[PDB]
Amino acid sequence: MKLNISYPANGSQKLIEVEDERKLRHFIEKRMGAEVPADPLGDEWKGYILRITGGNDKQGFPMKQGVIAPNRVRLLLSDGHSCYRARRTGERKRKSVRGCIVGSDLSVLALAIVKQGEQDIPGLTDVVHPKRLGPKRATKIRRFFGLSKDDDVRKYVIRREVQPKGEGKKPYTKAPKIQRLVTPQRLQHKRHRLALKRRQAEKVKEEASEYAQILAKRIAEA
Amino acid sequence: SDSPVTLRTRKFIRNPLLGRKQMVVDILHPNRPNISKDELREKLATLYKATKDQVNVFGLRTQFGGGKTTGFALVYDSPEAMKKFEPHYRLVRVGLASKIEKASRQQRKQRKNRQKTLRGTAKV
């Protein structure tokens, strides 16, 4: 009974296997998404609350949440379904799926830390993996560092040094080129759209004025 | 051979669209087998005051009984125009371009089909 514990805050991942099921007994009748204390898993897990996120049975079939069945079922999946990767536009496929009710006849179960305890498990809380920075949208940069409407977002960009190909050259940094930022090009494009829109405006009205002129002179001579 | 090689040009036209001149070349070469593509090129170049790299010829079919060959000759205004316009197979045979070495057709297709079973950066 291998357990895949995840720590969303620190981004830590480790697998630990439990050979005695009596520490898993309180997990048998639970369901995906249920927050369960991990007291039997202790005593290093006292004061720890775990959330069920799914698991794989002994045949490797994943758990699709929302299927209320302790056994395996066959479903017709589609693009947006949670255990199918459609390789064609509109293609649907029938695949074997394990139900959301966890229990016996299972190989690996996925866990997540909900509430921190007063312990230090080697591999979960001891390591704080840095978040893969970073934001790319202009407003997301603005809200992240608390800028204002008149601040220069152009300079508040996360850096990351890169080592060249062992040539002993000076290292430089990459940047997340910011999208949805105001440029004179965008303003010029907005200016051009109105410029093209206005140009059509007189052209139709002068032709309408012109066509009225011929009709005016045609009726006069007629 | 002792007898001179006589050059002739018909259907001559100036084509600035590809920056070249198109014509059909006729050869009168009695008492000799034929003329090579190479020695044909300098003779055209010296006749048109161009260089060897200015001149390319397509295909020489000797007329029945010998003594005459006909073909399509191409001379360019600038060497850059030839390199940009002349097809790669023509460049490799005349010698100023390197052949694009690649695997066999079936092996490349088999190489591609194995890629379809892989996803992401695991392909490379």
Binding site: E207, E210, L215 | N15, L17, L18, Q22, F85
Partner: protein, 256 residues
């Protein structure tokens, strides 16, 4: 499944293209635009099978999208753009303009125009209705939409449209005594004078055309194209739209 075709067979290609039968299995297929496909003329055929510049598919494709061929003054990068009737083809690299006009044999010829005939086109009025806002509009044979035509252009008239603004210089009314060219049927490429117009309710009215040799003919107004009111407004190809029999054609060769 079922859908539109994308290939064309060389044997089933239009005859007037004068395509080599043994060159390959397929033939160029026009995409869309200045149609009908029967008849039209692809740009590749015009530049490769009539000018050889452009010897095969690769070179003509390079020429097309080097932006050097102006159809009616407009850049076309389509290798198989359907060049059609009265269309003006321009090659500024060599400095000349071509126009597509049928000859007596019924096939497009390489007709040349020097400097000023490339500034306009004759088009046949196919539709006159009221536009989206009660605005009268006119449709020509080359899909050109004109948003403000003269009120006296009813049907089948030929309008001289300017080739850099689209404006109409002048129009010719469809009536007897006008110079007409037969653009369809058995009498392709024949230029004459309209003499009689008999009306048959049912959509198959007949037009009688008289040639320069006092020859009487008949055609529908689906193939009658008006060229001039008193004299042709364009330059005709050699022969001036007069068809000669097999004997006189041979005699012209023996004399010349």
């Amino acid at each position: 499944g079922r859908g539109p075709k994308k290939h064309q067979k060389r044997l089933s290609a239009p005859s007037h293209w004068l395509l080599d039968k043994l060159s390959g299995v397929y033939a160029p297929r026009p995409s869309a635009g200045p149609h009908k496909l029967r008849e039209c003329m692809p740009l590749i055929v015009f530049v490769r099978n009539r000018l050889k510049y452009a010897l095969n598919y690769r070179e003509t494709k390079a020429i097309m999208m080097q932006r050097l061929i102006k159809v009616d003054g407009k850049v076309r990068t389509d290798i198989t753009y359907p060049a059609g009737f009265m269309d003006v083809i321009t090659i500024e690299k060599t400095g000349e303009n071509f126009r597509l006009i049928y000859d007596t044999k019924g096939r497009f010829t390489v007709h040349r125009i020097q400097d000023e005939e490339a500034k306009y086109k004759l088009g046949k009025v196919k539709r006159v209705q009221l536009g989206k806002g009660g605005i009268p509009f006119l449709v020509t044979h080359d899909a050109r939409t004109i948003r403000y035509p003269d009120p006296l252009i009813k049907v089948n008239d030929t309008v001289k449209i300017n080739l850099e603004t689209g404006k109409i210089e002048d129009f010719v009314k469809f009536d007897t005594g006008a110079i007409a060219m037969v653009t369809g049927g058995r009498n392709m490429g024949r230029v004459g004078v309209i003499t009689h117009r008999e009306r048959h309710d049912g959509g198959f009215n007949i037009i009688h055309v008289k040639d320069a040799l006092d020859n009487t003919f008949a055609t529908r107004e689906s193939n009658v194209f008006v060229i001039g009111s008193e004299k042709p407004w364009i330059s005709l190809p050699k022969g001036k739209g007069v068809k000669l029999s097999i004997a006189e054609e041979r005699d012209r060769r023996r004399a010349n």
